[PDB]
Scaffold this motif. Sequence first.
Motif, PDB file in Angstrom:
ATOM      1  N   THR A 177       0.583  -1.173   0.140  1.00 29.99           N
ATOM      2  CA  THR A 177      -0.170  -0.014  -0.066  1.00 29.99           C
ATOM      3  C   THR A 177       0.850   1.165  -0.067  1.00 29.99           C
ATOM      4  O   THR A 177       1.504   1.335   0.847  1.00 29.99           O
ATOM      5  CB  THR A 177      -0.916  -0.086   1.223  1.00 29.99           C
ATOM      6  OG1 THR A 177      -0.187  -0.108   2.514  1.00 29.99           O
ATOM      7  CG2 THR A 177      -1.922  -1.307   1.185  1.00 29.99           C
ATOM      8  N   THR A 178       0.543   2.139  -0.973  1.00 30.42           N
ATOM      9  CA  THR A 178       1.081   3.495  -1.033  1.00 30.42           C
ATOM     10  C   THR A 178       0.326   4.358  -0.081  1.00 30.42           C
ATOM     11  O   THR A 178      -0.631   3.840   0.439  1.00 30.42           O
ATOM     12  CB  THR A 178       1.059   4.215  -2.623  1.00 30.42           C
ATOM     13  OG1 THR A 178      -0.322   4.060  -2.791  1.00 30.42           O
ATOM     14  CG2 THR A 178       1.812   2.947  -3.460  1.00 30.42           C
ATOM     15  N   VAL A 179       0.851   5.451   0.053  1.00 31.68           N
ATOM     16  CA  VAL A 179       0.259   6.576   0.884  1.00 31.68           C
ATOM     17  C   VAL A 179      -0.467   7.517  -0.025  1.00 31.68           C
ATOM     18  O   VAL A 179      -1.649   7.644   0.153  1.00 31.68           O
ATOM     19  CB  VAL A 179       1.265   7.256   1.760  1.00 31.68           C
ATOM     20  CG1 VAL A 179       0.503   8.220   2.675  1.00 31.68           C
ATOM     21  CG2 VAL A 179       2.206   6.378   2.552  1.00 31.68           C
ATOM     22  N   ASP A 180       0.249   8.239  -0.898  1.00 33.17           N
ATOM     23  CA  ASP A 180      -0.502   9.073  -1.862  1.00 33.17           C
ATOM     24  C   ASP A 180      -1.322   8.311  -2.993  1.00 33.17           C
ATOM     25  O   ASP A 180      -0.932   8.236  -4.055  1.00 33.17           O
ATOM     26  CB  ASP A 180       0.384  10.118  -2.512  1.00 33.17           C
ATOM     27  CG  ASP A 180       0.954  11.232  -1.487  1.00 33.17           C
ATOM     28  OD1 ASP A 180       0.208  11.775  -0.506  1.00 33.17           O
ATOM     29  OD2 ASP A 180       1.890  11.931  -1.621  1.00 33.17           O
ATOM     30  N   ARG A 181      -2.443   7.582  -2.557  1.00 33.75           N
ATOM     31  CA  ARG A 181      -3.397   6.943  -3.452  1.00 33.75           C
ATOM     32  C   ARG A 181      -4.047   7.869  -4.400  1.00 33.75           C
ATOM     33  O   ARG A 181      -5.320   7.586  -4.359  1.00 33.75           O
ATOM     34  CB  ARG A 181      -3.984   5.888  -2.857  1.00 33.75           C
ATOM     35  CG  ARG A 181      -3.406   5.018  -2.052  1.00 33.75           C
ATOM     36  CD  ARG A 181      -4.305   4.144  -1.602  1.00 33.75           C
ATOM     37  NE  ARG A 181      -4.923   3.269  -2.431  1.00 33.75           N
ATOM     38  CZ  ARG A 181      -6.152   2.380  -2.115  1.00 33.75           C
ATOM     39  NH1 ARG A 181      -6.699   2.201  -0.851  1.00 33.75           N
ATOM     40  NH2 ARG A 181      -6.472   2.014  -3.218  1.00 33.75           N
ATOM     41  N   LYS A 182      -3.402   8.856  -4.822  1.00 29.37           N
ATOM     42  CA  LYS A 182      -4.169   9.782  -5.645  1.00 29.37           C
ATOM     43  C   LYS A 182      -3.641   9.624  -7.073  1.00 29.37           C
ATOM     44  O   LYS A 182      -4.594   9.498  -8.116  1.00 29.37           O
ATOM     45  CB  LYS A 182      -3.946  11.328  -5.156  1.00 29.37           C
ATOM     46  CG  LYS A 182      -4.798  12.331  -6.126  1.00 29.37           C
ATOM     47  CD  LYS A 182      -4.288  13.550  -5.671  1.00 29.37           C
ATOM     48  CE  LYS A 182      -4.808  13.826  -4.367  1.00 29.37           C
ATOM     49  NZ  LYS A 182      -4.355  15.445  -3.783  1.00 29.37           N
ATOM     50  N   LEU A 183      -2.633   9.462  -7.548  1.00 30.38           N
ATOM     51  CA  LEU A 183      -2.154   9.013  -8.660  1.00 30.38           C
ATOM     52  C   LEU A 183      -1.956   7.424  -9.058  1.00 30.38           C
ATOM     53  O   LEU A 183      -1.827   7.116 -10.233  1.00 30.38           O
ATOM     54  CB  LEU A 183      -0.730   9.307  -8.736  1.00 30.38           C
ATOM     55  CG  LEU A 183      -0.397  10.770  -8.083  1.00 30.38           C
ATOM     56  CD1 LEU A 183       1.040  10.690  -8.006  1.00 30.38           C
ATOM     57  CD2 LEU A 183      -0.974  11.681  -9.299  1.00 30.38           C
ATOM     58  N   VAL A 184      -2.819   6.718  -8.110  1.00 32.66           N
ATOM     59  CA  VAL A 184      -2.979   5.343  -8.408  1.00 32.66           C
ATOM     60  C   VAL A 184      -4.451   4.952  -8.624  1.00 32.66           C
ATOM     61  O   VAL A 184      -4.901   4.236  -9.826  1.00 32.66           O
ATOM     62  CB  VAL A 184      -2.789   4.729  -7.372  1.00 32.66           C
ATOM     63  CG1 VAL A 184      -3.140   3.059  -7.195  1.00 32.66           C
ATOM     64  CG2 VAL A 184      -1.185   4.606  -7.013  1.00 32.66           C
ATOM     65  N   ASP A 185      -5.479   5.445  -8.194  1.00 28.24           N
ATOM     66  CA  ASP A 185      -6.834   5.117  -8.195  1.00 28.24           C
ATOM     67  C   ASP A 185      -7.430   6.155  -9.289  1.00 28.24           C
ATOM     68  O   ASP A 185      -6.576   7.212  -9.899  1.00 28.24           O
ATOM     69  CB  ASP A 185      -7.709   5.537  -6.780  1.00 28.24           C
ATOM     70  CG  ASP A 185      -7.116   5.003  -5.744  1.00 28.24           C
ATOM     71  OD1 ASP A 185      -6.539   3.882  -5.873  1.00 28.24           O
ATOM     72  OD2 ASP A 185      -7.258   5.313  -4.494  1.00 28.24           O
ATOM     73  N   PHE A 186      -8.715   5.989  -9.982  1.00 27.17           N
ATOM     74  CA  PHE A 186      -9.237   6.380 -10.739  1.00 27.17           C
ATOM     75  C   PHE A 186     -10.295   7.602 -10.358  1.00 27.17           C
ATOM     76  O   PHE A 186     -10.342   8.497 -10.994  1.00 27.17           O
ATOM     77  CB  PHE A 186      -9.856   5.623 -11.910  1.00 27.17           C
ATOM     78  CG  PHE A 186     -10.225   6.430 -13.268  1.00 27.17           C
ATOM     79  CD1 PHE A 186      -9.464   6.934 -13.984  1.00 27.17           C
ATOM     80  CD2 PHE A 186     -11.804   6.608 -13.347  1.00 27.17           C
ATOM     81  CE1 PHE A 186      -9.802   7.732 -15.275  1.00 27.17           C
ATOM     82  CE2 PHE A 186     -11.969   7.508 -14.516  1.00 27.17           C
ATOM     83  CZ  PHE A 186     -11.273   7.912 -15.169  1.00 27.17           C
ATOM     84  N   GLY A 187     -10.660   7.592  -8.939  1.00 28.77           N
ATOM     85  CA  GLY A 187     -11.430   8.554  -8.395  1.00 28.77           C
ATOM     86  C   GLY A 187     -12.387   7.902  -7.322  1.00 28.77           C
ATOM     87  O   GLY A 187     -12.278   6.590  -7.029  1.00 28.77           O
TER      88      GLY A 187
END
Lengths: 85, 253, 291, 291, 315, 291
Positions: free
Chosen positions: B86-96
């Motif tokens: 698990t990454t921390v900044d899961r903003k560049l990973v998820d689509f929304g």
Amino acid sequence: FPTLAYEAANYDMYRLKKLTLRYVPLVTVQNSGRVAMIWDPDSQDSAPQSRQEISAYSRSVSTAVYEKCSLTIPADNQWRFVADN
Amino acid sequence: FPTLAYEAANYDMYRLKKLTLRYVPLVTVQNSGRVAMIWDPDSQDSAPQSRQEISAYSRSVSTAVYEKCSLTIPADNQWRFVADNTTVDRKLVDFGQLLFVTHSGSDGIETGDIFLDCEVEFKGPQPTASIVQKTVIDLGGTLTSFEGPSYLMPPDAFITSSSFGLFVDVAGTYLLTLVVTCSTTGSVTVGGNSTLVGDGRAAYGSSNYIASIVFTSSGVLSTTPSVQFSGSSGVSRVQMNICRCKQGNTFIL
Amino acid sequence: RGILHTQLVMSVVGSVQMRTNNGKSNQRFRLNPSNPALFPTLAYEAANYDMYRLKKLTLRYVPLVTVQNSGRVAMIWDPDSQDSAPQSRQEISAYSRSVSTAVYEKCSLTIPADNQWRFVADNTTVDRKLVDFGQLLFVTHSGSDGIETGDIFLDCEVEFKGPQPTASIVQKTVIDLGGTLTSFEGPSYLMPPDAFITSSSFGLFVDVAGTYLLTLVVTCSTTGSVTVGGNSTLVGDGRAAYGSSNYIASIVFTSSGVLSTTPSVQFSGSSGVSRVQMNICRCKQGNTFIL
Amino acid sequence: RGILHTQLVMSVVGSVQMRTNNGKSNQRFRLNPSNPALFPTLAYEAANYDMYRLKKLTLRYVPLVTVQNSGRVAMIWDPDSQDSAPQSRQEISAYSRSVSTAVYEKCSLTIPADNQWRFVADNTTVDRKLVDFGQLLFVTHSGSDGIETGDIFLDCEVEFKGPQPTASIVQKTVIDLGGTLTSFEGPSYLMPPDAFITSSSFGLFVDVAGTYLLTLVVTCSTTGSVTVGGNSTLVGDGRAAYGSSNYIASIVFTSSGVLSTTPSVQFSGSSGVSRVQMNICRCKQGNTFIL
Amino acid sequence: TPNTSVKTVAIPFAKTQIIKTVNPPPILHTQLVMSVVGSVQMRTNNGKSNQRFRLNPSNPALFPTLAYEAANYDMYRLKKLTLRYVPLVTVQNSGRVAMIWDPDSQDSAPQSRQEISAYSRSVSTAVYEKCSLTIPADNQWRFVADNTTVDRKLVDFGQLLFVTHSGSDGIETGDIFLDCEVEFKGPQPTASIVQKTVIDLGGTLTSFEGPSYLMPPDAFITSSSFGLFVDVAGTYLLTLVVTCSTTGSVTVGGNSTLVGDGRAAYGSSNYIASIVFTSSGVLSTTPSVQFSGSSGVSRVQMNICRCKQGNTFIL
Amino acid sequence: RGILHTQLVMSVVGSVQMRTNNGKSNQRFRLNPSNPALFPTLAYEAANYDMYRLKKLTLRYVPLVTVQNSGRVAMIWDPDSQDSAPQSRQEISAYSRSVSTAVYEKCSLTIPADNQWRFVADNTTVDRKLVDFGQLLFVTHSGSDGIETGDIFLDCEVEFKGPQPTASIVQKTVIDLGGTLTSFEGPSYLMPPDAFITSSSFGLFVDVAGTYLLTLVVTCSTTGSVTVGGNSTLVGDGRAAYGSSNYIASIVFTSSGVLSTTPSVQFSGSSGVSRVQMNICRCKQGNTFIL
Ligand SMILES: [Ca+2]
Ligand SMILES: [Ca+2]
Ligand SMILES: [Ca+2]
Ligand SMILES: [Ca+2]
């Protein structure tokens, strides 16, 4: 199948189309021995337990240790259950 | 994706081609209310927290309860990582996100249900991903997940000096291993969101307290913790493992 | 050409939380013609044979309730017959053949048939997996809890290969204190989580929706009354007797298949219940006992 | 395609003088498929339908006795179903399809079939003459007094037209003092002149050769034991009980379907028997009650 | 092609139907049969007998007009058969109505939920929503039921069963229509359209001389009382002839009302009355014609005629 | 393509009441070619392969008795291999392929064959229902009490698919006190309910009709002689020995495969028998030990 077993959890039926067994040696022509590769149509027989049973099983390649083998298994067309529960 | 998550363990990249949200009502033209369906491009914003934010998010359909909706989400062409280790900044990973806001009902009634359509394709494969969570709580802290996936999320559990509770809202059948650092023993009950497969075997010993529960949750709200451990003293750490197992993986008296 | 057979399968009772085949395990709706739940009228033909082959299969959920009770009935086919029942609400779309709509609106689902002859279950096989054609699973999750939503019909063209002396269509079940229902010499009208005994009482839940005939043989020390209610009414001629340590009664009741939180047949008032032996036959209304 | 169905009809008991259905009346072998004497297995299939049509019909009497006993067995097919018995010897061969040979040697008889659809017997007809396909009569008339001689099989291709719910697997028969058996809503499985009551005793002659489940409900004043006679044997679990003025029993027995001058199920020892009510189910070697 | 097809259904509100006649010629023929009264538990033909709706043209329930023309003939066919349940209620009342056709005319009725769905030919939708059932025909000629036979299985064409459950209790839910093209072969003089039914103590009704207004599970006698449940919905003309020892009174119950000049008389051991009543066919748990207060009733003989409101006697 | 193979199956011993495999259970006549009761010669060929396919299957019961004994012999082919025994007489003719005649007269029965390949029985299956081709059942039910009546032959065209090494000609069976025969790695050649032990004695009933070689290994405390009973005879060379707590014997005997109420191989006279271990080989009139 250490990788396909996760994809095999998401399905019920399977086939097997192409089956080759491709023993690769890692040793010079100095070490004696014998490696045999055997395919049964049963999945509940025992194993030899002799030298008699190694050669003529039905479908077997039994060359030396230092030399390469290749065994192919003919396929079927039936659909079989993935082993769950 | 309760089914694709197992196939998602065998891959690294993903796209999403077609995305529709297709709220289907189950109620006559007698019950007032409003259901809105919202898609964010962020995956880390909060939610309203007003009536102002419901309508104009960017891409939202906000009709009534008794009448059908349909929302489509435009896609991209980028390849994104499947969330493993698990990454921390899961903003560049998820689509929304999806947000699903209701108000002014028609209180706690089966009003409708929300369907979701996808064409997901996967690029280069992994061996697997470990589908067992590992979450740890300290006194005053929250859940911090390790080893993936995302069954439990940090606003789901609370600990005290003497008690413990989990609000499981994913609706499956699971397999816990409580490891609680206590000083005394305690009991584990199963609350409102879920029921036992009633042979939960636990044991005490040293400072650890080890249990193993099989419960089946429904995901509906209830104001009781779905798995509650209470009656002990000096709880400091609770460690978890959750597995999604069927009703044959229960222990036997 | 064959002959179609429309057959009643369930009376679908809604649920709030999450529920499979309503009160029962993932054992009820096996696709064998030796199953009284899915085949209430072809089980009499299935007792004569040992091989079957399905040709046409449709499910036909037909609603009954007014359009005010929100719900979601789902009908799911498995190719296995030993996969576990689904766990969540959202482990439904991951199946292969599935129709899930609201309670108040009719559906349809066609199942593609094979061409393999398969054995008719008169056993006690270990692997149901290679015998059955598969499972049928029925899921309800919104609300409208204690309400008969609708009922599921099922259409077949079944042909049978080589015959057999008739499998005995009379159950025989035994309960001990702390035990469960254990069937003997078939069929499967009652499933094991359908009864309970105490030191003084006894009860059976019956959800197959027929008209039956019991022979209670209960080992007690005192007599006890037998009440019938909840799902079934008496065709009211229930004649019992007492004597030695046995208690013998014979009941003709008509169940309706709906769930209820009351036993369909209940025996209470006695003391020291140790064994209850049963025989169920699926009789008709003319098989009562004149007072 | 059709499927043949070899089925046991009788076990022939020879007699010296003249006898037509080894004692039983000219009512037993109606050619409806709702007749358990002629269709011990097809009656379960035929309980789902209203119309039927016979395609192939054969006998094959098969002997069982050594070639030392003289005698003669005849097999007869009326096209009527209400003609009387063949009173004399000259009437035996005068039927349309008739084959008569010795006791110790096998036979065969084919019946030509029609193409009409006829109703299946449901609970009352008066003119059987238009519903049945005909009788079968089985005359024995010289000296092989009552030794089991052989048995008669029967083959069918039966197709059914439009379906129906199941009708009745179970009989209800009631006897009063001086009266006879009167059935209510079942097959038969008994017929009237096959039971007798007295002021103190009770008996049943069963000649169908199946394995049955009784429920004796007898209004008594004192208790009474139940024996199982010479035609049939127990499976040793005949749990009964007393109580109020009723006497309640439930027996599982298997009958060979052979004549004997002993009642197959006998109830004696009590006093003031007034009513006896029955329910017969055709179970298996399962449903007996564990002690 | 995305493997999941979302289809939308807009369940509006009350659906109804509107029925006009034209009529033109000197032949399809729609008629009412019932008004469907929903029930909570389980019910057949709604409280009427187990044998009532029965496909002969000499049957007053299904053909109140053709039964007079059916008296002048012997053979009949039935060409077109539709059953067209029309609702009269909004989407607010739950329940279920099923419409069943048997090929038998002597079976019983369910008596379960198991038997409703798969009879052979059945439509079993909800109360608030319309149904339509068609029955395939034959080409055989069958006797019109005159000089009453016993095995009325080879005479009739079948039954109609009309099962409701799980209501919506005793409310005008809907009504059932029936269409026919009936043709008749060679003619009779007439048929006597007056029943003659006799009851003994412990027995039931045994009809003579035809037609089938009253059916054997409609009357009960005691040592002192008498009752009839007329469920055909016409206006009739009785002649009670009751073998008593004392006098008695005749009242008219819930299914029906007098045309209130019923003149009766006593005399010898007979008791003779003559009543004109108008029945509605709806259930009520009172006998529609009740004779009580007497002593030692043994026989009751009847004659019923279907007469209008001018055939009443005058005080 | 082929070559036919006429093979001895049984020697029929008649019985009065009802008997299904003249005493032995519903396990004996599985239609695998790894079954020495049905295939006394083809099991050696079938021990080299894994798949088989039957092409022609016939009976032909052949009598041996004078025409003075009444009786009846029936031959039955289930398509199942796990159905129970035919409990009554009406069940006998109701199978798919069934021929029943008198004792003194010959028969024949043909079985229609499939085209599927099935596994040969290797050391463990649980669902025999999918591996075997079916059962064979042999009912005798009227009075020719236990005289040898006749014997039943069997014809085959068997082809085998892909080979295998040889599996097992020899049994190993172990008995403990209170227990039964449990085989380990062999054919059968015995089956469980065909041996009995006491605290001091030992017995074997062999009904397969071959010529065998035993090795008795019996944990004793004292010695004991070995007799050969009524079914079978010695070849007079039964050399045995004692030593430590074991008792070791090796016998060559030939059995007729007929019922008798005497153990075919009996070991008595010793004390404290705890284990008996066996090895059976099917020798000839050679391998006896010269004195
Ligand atoms: Ca093998
Ligand atoms: Ca944002
Ligand atoms: Ca079977
Ligand atoms: Ca019928």
